[PDB]
Amino acid sequence: ENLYFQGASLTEIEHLVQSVCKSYRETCQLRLEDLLRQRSNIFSREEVTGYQRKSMWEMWERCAHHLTEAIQYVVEFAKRLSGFMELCQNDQIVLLKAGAMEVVLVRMCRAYNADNRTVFFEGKYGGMELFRALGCSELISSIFDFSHSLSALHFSEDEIALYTALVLINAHRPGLQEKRKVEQLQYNLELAFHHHLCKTHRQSILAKLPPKGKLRSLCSQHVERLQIFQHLHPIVVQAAFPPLYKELFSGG
């Protein structure tokens, strides 16, 4: 059905690097140059206080909407990824349901400033204290620590492209019908990533990448905190949370 569902030559792996990087550049949501430029645009003490005084439900709704916006770009990235549209719809859904949030969490390191420990949120940079009204301090600091750890690797845009492609194309996701097809696509995407690292003398980052359990822990924590919020404000979730967010994190 697709070339990358079988064994690929060196020239075909080189083509895969270019294709993945193109798919990412076209769906990256915000340009790295735009994020870097806005690092000096930091929320004032008054602005931080304003976010802290928002209700728990209002903050959750705002955050769920922004995360939904980010996920939609991840869906477009998947659609443009070599071989993804050749998989059956069950498997496309399985991969996006398990991997969409993982991709957003990786992409977020671009929007994280390791120098002052701030993240780009609603037009400016703010520290983790900006999210205090959510009532999920552990989850927030775990996301900030993850972004700090990824930022220390000094990822290029091409590295984020290849790595996120691998985060999404995971043959171990429970529920995959055509597991062997996914395994071969994963193998080729692994070769594309490792080829690019070899070519750019960046193989030293391989031993520095987070273990797969790390992204799983973050997603499980997210689902857990959402459940706590849902019990407290069920109508807020039912009436005002984005439909896509609900389909991915609370089974519709």
Binding site: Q72, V75, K79, Q89, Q92, I93, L96, K97, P243, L244, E247, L248, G252
Partner: peptide
């Protein structure tokens, strides 16, 4: 529902 729609919309 949404994911199905997003994947079908070309």
């Amino acid at each position: 529902k949404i994911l199905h729609r997003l994947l079908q919309d070309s």
